[PDB]
């Protein structure tokens, strides 16, 4: 069922409308998606690639980019930011 973001991830999620301290992973992905879209962090030509250098997201995930297709690795990056 539920996960507890650490403070900085929680700040990211709350920046795109999230209201809670705990979430399902699907809600986490949902708000993270809103974030990526609002900040236009994905490559306009190869839209699976997210560029997160010099963004809060990149600080959290510890990478300068990643591929949306790498589902398991994205979970790894999020789980670094769960209590």
């Amino acid at each position: 069922t539920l996960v507890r973001p650490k403070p900085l991830l929680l700040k990211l999620l709350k920046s795109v409308g999230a209201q809670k301290d705990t979430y399902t992973m699907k809600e986490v992905l949902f708000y993270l998606g809103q974030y990526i879209m609002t900040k236009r962090l994905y490559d306009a030509a190869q839209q699976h690639i997210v560029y997160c250098s010099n963004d809060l997201l990149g600080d959290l995930f510890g990478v300068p980019s990643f591929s949306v297709k790498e589902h398991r690795k994205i979970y790894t990056m999020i789980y670094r930011n769960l209590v």
């Binding site: 992905l29 998606g33 839209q47």
Partner: peptide, 12 residues
């Protein structure tokens, strides 16, 4: 695909 189409696969 579009970003959102890739993201939806992830979300599902």
């Amino acid at each position: 695909l579009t970003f959102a189409e890739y993201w939806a696969q992830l979300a599902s």
